[PDB]
Design a protein around this ligand. Structure first.
Ligand code: PC1
Ligand code: PC1
Ligand code: PC1
Ligand code: PC1
Ligand code: PC1
Ligand code: PC1
Ligand code: PC1
Ligand code: PC1
Ligand code: DU0
Ligand code: DU0
Ligand code: DU0
Ligand code: DU0
Ligand code: DU0
Lengths: 41, 51, 135, 43, 91, 318, 318, 51, 91, 41, 135, 43
């Protein structure tokens, strides 16, 4: 499991692309889900 | 196409225009303001930072 | 443990065969440790020899502008690799590539001898010894 | 290295053709909202 | 590795051993192959733990600085805002 | 014929579209209102601004600074009117940057900028810009250092188009044409952009044909808080960075903070310590190197007392 | 004999003299209370201090910093008592600095300091100090890295003496003995110091036999303002610098500013933005290079609530 | 003067003392405080920065 | 410098002169020794003035930054102190 | 006049010593004369 | 002025003697300007020659450690002086002193030719030409 | 260069003599206030 994920997440030519894209996925969900309004305000 | 003498003259025009803008652009803005502002400030106050 | 140690010590002191059995095992291990060291050095020597051979296949620039750019790049690469203790072999190769392109390697060696760390110099020195073509 | 004159002419034509295709897309964009209006009216 | 070579240590004595030799004999008790292989793992284990402590320490510093650098200005700005809300409410 | 033109215009008007604004602004709500990128600085900074009028707008500004790539001194003056706006700023070294925007028509604007560098040679530039703002679209063309002196068109040219598709969706196009020298072939690049805008949130993207992609999302978290996230991808090597940040609007201060996938953290605090004085504290921490850049600054406006009666001229083309 | 000793002591007591304090403090009122030299820093700094008791004093402190020659982290803890004081601080790199002062007698104090540096070799040091405080004089002796391992005395030795001549005038002496290696001859240096002290102003001087001279003057300018000037001369080349500065004591903040003949200007502002929080802003401007170093910091003390009942133990030998 | 073996032993004593102070000095201070403070804090609170 | 060498320019004409030559003749009116010595002083005078302006400008910047860097924190600190004095006086 | 003062004040081996000493002379007078209390407070 | 200028122009155009008198003065000034230039160059050449001679009297270090320290100091001094346009002569002397101590001046010259400004190189080049002993 | 042993002995004696002269001054300082007292009583 991790071997098939860690390679594409930390030791690949596109590791920086995946990390940036994944971080974007969380942030959008964090905002749209209303949790941010319940947390940041 | 274009004459070499013409290119020299045209290039000279750019150099002259460059010098004029370098020296004259800022004084021009102050003149427009100083003459068109409402009211007109004092010449000393016109460039005073806070006095 | 102490009772066994006393018996072990008593046997070791008074029984020569007990020492001989232990000494034979100890001597056998001493041999293995030496053989292991020799194998590692030869393998390391091959990597050093390989590194010079690898540089020969990649080739070196011929023009002065490319030689200067390559020299600076190899020096920059060597210094960057010199900070990593795992790249001493790689650092020496960069210094070797630059040294092979520099017009007066002998003068550059004196610079490396003062600016480059000995662990890289040791690899680089063997690289120089392997590349008998270095002037 | 420096390019040859025919290669320059090839590049000049290609670049112009690309921008001409762009303006063709821009015209589609200017006309695009009426197309989108039809979609709301298709159902 | 010859029985005749090993036979050179024909004689030994308990009193002949020096205090250092008797103390050194304690290390000889452990098999050299095992002790050498255990020492190797000891080095690997100590390095891994030190790397973990450095990472855990570096992480705590990162979170600590983040909370201060963001929370400190915020607490003051948010706090100052609350005073105006209190003073305005008293009107 | 006008018969079709009128019918076409009428059919156009009934869609209820609106001007989407400049292409460079499709991400303004994120790249400038939330992220700190445009406010970060280091060292000390001080702005002494004197306002002499509000209609016409006329103000003179002195900036003192001591920091990384900050000029020790910068004198700036600007004049504005409902039909025009002229600004000039000069460094202690004589580097002069200027702007001149004029409204030939309420829907047509010409923008001229200059950057003059004295005896030391830093390339001086001239940028001419033309903008059109229709009822439902915007068109733009730029010409940077346009020259025909070599007998052929030279310089940098940019064409921009943005179209409102629905009251909320905006789609656009960008085209570039370049030829640094007539001896070499011209280079052209195209970029596609788009935006979907709503009262609570706005999402935008900018895709280059080269493969780079810039996307951002903005959402309001109440009356005083808003946050946004920005992602940038490059395939020149493959590289990408994602920035998340939030902004707080208190009564007397505005706080901005952001963090990005490269481990950088930054915050900016602007506080009105007095009626004419505004403080700014900026800090950027790089967690991979543990180094921080600190910026402290001040802005002073002293012309308000006489100016209170007047009112800023409307729609100054800033 | 005690007969003369008693008469001598009695004759001594009738002069009304008083202890002049440590030699290093003859300029404290200037070099630390007015000049900014001891407070200047750059970058960001944050101190999280937890006080657990006041008698005995015991507190734990966390310092986070990111700047020039500032350690990313420093953990410090200290314990104090009317008879003793122990302190230790350790950097993230393991550099450990320690202090241990013990009162064998109210007039006799032993001070021990250590500085340990791990695998990387930075010279580690040991400093032993003995102080005597008579009714009218002070004597001090220090031994830094004292060693006899080579068969001869080695290390650094310092002897200090300061004597009150009148209720206001203090005169002193300093002697140094050094021998970094037995293969080379010992080096000795002597320095003369003196001070005249009054309620409103204090003047002090420190003259080295080498030719260097350090003089300072301090004067109170009212209940809330005080200023002082410090001059230093060196003849190693001939060099001299003169520093003038002032300090303001407002209710919630203390402001320090100074300028010196080398064109440097610096100011430090400490402000109590809250009951446990104190801010510090420091700026140093070098007018000859137009570069400025900015420092922003914070100190937080959170243990007071339980601690309110207690009171600090008296005369802790800090 | 001094025996070389004695100097070796004395130098070893300094090295040992150096190591002990490096590791033991800070824990010692906390022990003195923790056992002598008035009142005695909680083990978790004993090194909490602000909680 | 021989009368025969200078005699080579035996003939001249007003129409033969080019517009540039007639314009260049204007510079020839000024004696070369004087104009060269005047131009030298012009260079020295322009350099000295530019040095003076740079010094005067550098001085104004120094005083301006000094007043701001010291006066700004002070005005706030002194100002904040005055508020406490006012609030305390109202008791 | 100035020649006999400027040399010892700006172009001599001890120029820095004289400048530091002179600056000290003014500061002490400025403090002791009471002007500072009339100016800084 | 215009009336005089017209008469002056008329006389200059139609009177050859008027031109000859002016031309003689102009020719005389042209000679003086050339003579002035030649005197300045020879005096400058003497300073360059003097600088090499002055360095010979001061001497150069003989030990490798002193040579390296002196070389670095001269390079540091040369760079520090290179920033001042009034020290081009002094900068070249520092580069000359270092160049004279460096074991391979020819290699160092290529470095100076790329790192040192031409105005200093021009002085340094003449210093090299004057010091026929430079290897 | 490294010093010779007799030069070291010369330095060791000089340095000791300097500090001995210092302690002699320190003794004067310890005794100095009584001398200053006499001056106020001399007039
Ligand atoms: C809680 C988790 C951390 C506990 C302590 C871990 C200490 C690890 C270490 O070596 O730290 C040094 C590290 C530095 O690690 P480093 O790797 O940069 O340097 C050490 C390198 N070696 C090990 C080879 C010598 O310091 C920190 O990262 C900060 C430590 C303090 C963290 C915050 C404490 C107060 C708030 C709670
Ligand atoms: C992780 C962030 C931690 C910030 C440090 C702690 C903040 C403590 C605030 C204490 C306080 O005064 O609370 C006020 C209040 C406490 O009260 P309250 O509002 O929660 O409830 C009481 C409400 N009344 C009074 C009306 C009844 O909390 C907040 O409003 C908190 C809002 C969140 C603020 C967090 C800091 C800024 C976050 C920026 C996010 C953007 C990305 C940042 C990236 C780096 C961080 C991941
Ligand atoms: C009306 C008076 C008030 C407004 C003044 C506007 C000045 C505009 C620029 C003037 C010319 C500058 C220049 O040529 O620089 C070239 C020189 C460069 O060196 P140079 O002179 O060797 O190069 C000249 C190059 N050409 C000929 C192509 C232009 O730079 C300077 O002299 C430096 C200073 C530039 C101006 C600095 C800011 C303005 C002065 C301070 C603010 C005004 C007073 C406030 C109180
Ligand atoms: C408005 C008047 C026209 C421009 C005046 C001169 C502006 C000069 C400038 O900033 O750059 C020179 C520029 C171009 O300069 P250029 O073509 O001489 O090139 C020099 C500048 N680089 C090297 C950066 C390309 O002026 C123009 O753009 C002239 C053509 C436009 C005329 C309308
Ligand atoms: C009781 C527990 C809480 C107090 C802990 C005190 C720790 C004192 C020092 C411990 C040993 C450090 C050491 O040997 O460093 C050498 C090493 C140097 O590398 P080395 O280990 O290769 O060298 C060792 C050299 N000799 C053997 C001579 C000592 O440095 C480190 O490991 C770096 C971290 C040092 C400690 C950092 C601060 C303390 C930890 C964070 C604060 C406490 C937690 C707060 C929450
Ligand atoms: C208290 C116990 C005595 C000192 C314990 C060790 C302290 C070590 C230290 O910090 O420096 C070593 C020091 C001296 O170390 P050293 O004499 O081995 O020299 C190494 C240090 N440098 C190079 C800086 C001189 O320890 C002493 O001072 C030992 C003598 C005093 C004993 C009483
Ligand atoms: C009033 C006195 C100053 C009037 C303007 C003098 C401008 C001189 C100049 O070149 O300035 C550039 C100088 C920089 O001088 P510099 O010598 O560092 O750079 C210019 C170098 N040359 C001339 C060769 C190109 O700028 C300043 O020192 C600051 C100018 C603004 C001062 C404050 C104005 C606002 C407050 C009143
Ligand atoms: C040159 C220094 C200029 C500082 C900048 C201007 C300060 C303006 C203050 C405005 C204000 O609020 O005034 C308060 C008041 C104004 O009122 P007032 O106190 O003068 O009179 C009114 C008094 N009441 C209200 C009670 C009736 O002035 C002061 O108290 C001024 C004290 C001097 C403060 C000057 C700044 C710090 C100086 C530090 C000196 C040490 C060396 C510094 C070296 C660098 C400077 C040479
Ligand atoms: C192109 C990239 C691929 C990944 C990604 O885009 C970028 O794909 C998007 C899908 C999004 C979710 C869609 C819908 C919802 C439901 C909503 O809840 C209220 C719904 C309401 C219905 O009546 C009440 O239930 C909260 C937000 C959430 C979970 C979105 C979160 C962000 C997500 C995961 C985005 C994610 C980042
Ligand atoms: C140039 C590129 C083209 C894509 C893009 O730019 C880049 O252009 C935008 C198109 C957007 C979608 C269009 C419409 C809807 C329907 C809406 O429905 C809400 C309810 C409502 C209607 O029923 C009634 O209230 C939810 C959001 C969604 C799916 C958008 C998602 C984001 C998208 C993909 C944006 C994306 C960034
Ligand atoms: C080691 C070096 C020795 C000199 C020195 O340290 C360095 O030691 C101090 C000696 C001081 C003087 C001693 C006494 C007085 C009389 C007093 O008279 C006020 C009125 C009062 C008595 O009548 C009644 O109120 C005015 C000041 C003055 C002249 C001192 C000046 C400063 C001096 C020179 C100080 C100087 C720094
Ligand atoms: C010569 C050059 C220009 C001027 C300058 O030197 C350089 O001279 C200094 C004078 C300073 C101001 C003096 C007093 C105050 C009042 C204070 O108190 C608000 C209290 C609040 C209560 O409600 C409202 O009244 C706010 C700040 C302010 C305006 C100072 C700002 C900085 C100034 C402008 C400095 C500036 C840099
Ligand atoms: C060793 C160096 C040589 C230069 C210097 O020391 C250092 O020599 C010192 C002499 C000092 C002055 C002496 C007396 C007074 C009179 C007093 O006024 C109240 C007097 C009162 C009598 O009843 C009412 O008149 C104000 C101060 C002033 C002027 C001193 C200023 C500082 C001076 C100039 C010092 C100066 C810096």
């Amino acid at each position: 499991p991790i071997t098939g994920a860690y390679n594409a997440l930390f030791v690949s030519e596109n590791a920086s692309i995946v990390r940036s894209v994944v971080a974007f996925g969380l942030a959008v969900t964090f905002l749209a889900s209303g949790w941010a309004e319940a947390i940041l305000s | 196409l274009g004459a070499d003498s013409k290119q020299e003259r045209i290039s000279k025009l750019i150099e002259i225009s460059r010098v004029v803008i370098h020296y004259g652009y800022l004084p021009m803005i102050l003149y427009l303001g100083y003459t068109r502002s409402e009211p007109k400030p004092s010449i000393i106050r016109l460039l005073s930072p806070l006095s | 443990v102490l009772a066994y140690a006393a018996y072990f010590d008593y046997q070791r002191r008074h029984n020569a065969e007990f020492r001989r059995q232990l000494r034979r095992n100890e001597r056998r291990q001493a041999r293995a440790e030496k053989d292991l060291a020799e194998a590692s050095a030869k393998a390391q020597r091959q990597r050093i020899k390989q590194a010079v051979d690898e540089a020969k296949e990649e080739g070196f620039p011929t023009s002065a502008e490319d030689k200067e750019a390559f020299f600076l790049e190899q020096v920059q690469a060597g210094e960057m690799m010199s900070a990593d203790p795992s790249k001493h072999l790689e650092a020496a190769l960069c210094f070797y590539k630059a040294l092979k392109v520099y017009p007066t390697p002998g003068d550059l060696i004196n610079i490396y001898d003062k600016t480059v760390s000995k662990p890289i110099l040791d690899i680089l020195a063997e690289m120089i010894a392997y590349d008998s073509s270095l002037r | 290295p420096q390019p040859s004159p025919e290669e320059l002419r090839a590049a000049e034509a290609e670049a112009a053709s690309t921008i001409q295709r762009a303006i063709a897309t821009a015209a589609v964009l200017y006309l695009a909202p009426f197309i989108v209006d039809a979609v709301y009216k298709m159902f | 590795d010859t029985d005749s070579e090993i036979s050179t240590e024909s004689n030994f004595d308990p009193s002949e051993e020096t205090l250092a030799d008797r103390l050194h004999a304690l290390r000889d008790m452990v098999p050299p192959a095992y002790r050498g292989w255990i020492y190797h793992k000891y080095e690997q284990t100590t390095s891994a733990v030190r790397k973990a402590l450095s990472f855990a320490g570096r992480a705590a510093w990162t979170v600590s600085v983040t909370a201060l650098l963001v929370g400190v200005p915020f607490s003051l700005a948010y706090g100052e805002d609350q005073q105006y809300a209190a003073m305005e409410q008293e009107q | 014929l006008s018969d079709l033109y009128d019918a076409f215009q009428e059919r156009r008007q009934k869609l209820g579209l609106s001007n989407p604004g400049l292409v460079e602004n499709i991400a303004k709500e994120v790249q400038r209102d939330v992220l700190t990128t445009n406010l970060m600085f280091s060292g000390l900074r001080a702005d002494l601004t004197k306002a002499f009028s509000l209609n016409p707008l006329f103000q003179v500004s002195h900036q003192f600074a001591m920091g990384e790539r900050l000029s020790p001194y910068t004198f700036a003056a600007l004049y504005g009117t409902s039909k025009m706006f002229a600004q000039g700023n000069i460094d202690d070294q004589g580097n002069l940057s200027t702007t001149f925007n004029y409204r030939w028509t309420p829907s047509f604007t010409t923008k001229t900028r200059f950057q003059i560098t004295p005896g030391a040679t830093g390339q001086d530039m001239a940028q001419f810009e033309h903008e059109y703002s229709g009822a439902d679209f915007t068109a733009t063309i730029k010409a940077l250092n346009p020259s025909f002196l070599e007998g052929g068109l030279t310089g940098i040219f940019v064409g921009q188009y943005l179209q409102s598709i629905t009251p909320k969706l905006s789609l656009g196009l960008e085209a570039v044409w370049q030829r640094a020298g007539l001896t070499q072939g011209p280079d052209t690049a195209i970029s596609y952009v788009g935006r979907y805008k709503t009262e609570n949130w706005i999402a935008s993207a900018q895709l280059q044909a080269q493969g780079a992609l810039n996307a951002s999302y903005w959402q309001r978290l109440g009356e005083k808080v808003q946050a946004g996230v920005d992602m940038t991808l490059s395939v020149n090597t493959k590289e990408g960075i994602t920035t998340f940040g939030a902004k707080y609007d208190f009564r007397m201060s505005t706080f901005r903070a952001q963090i990005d996938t490269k481990g950088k953290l930054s915050c900016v605090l602007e506080k009105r310590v007095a009626a004419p004085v505004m403080m700014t504290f900026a800090a950027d921490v790089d967690h991979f190197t543990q180094q921080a850049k600190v910026g402290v600054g001040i802005s002073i406006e002293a012309g308000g007392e006489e100016l209170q009666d007047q009112q800023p001229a409307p729609n100054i083309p800033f």
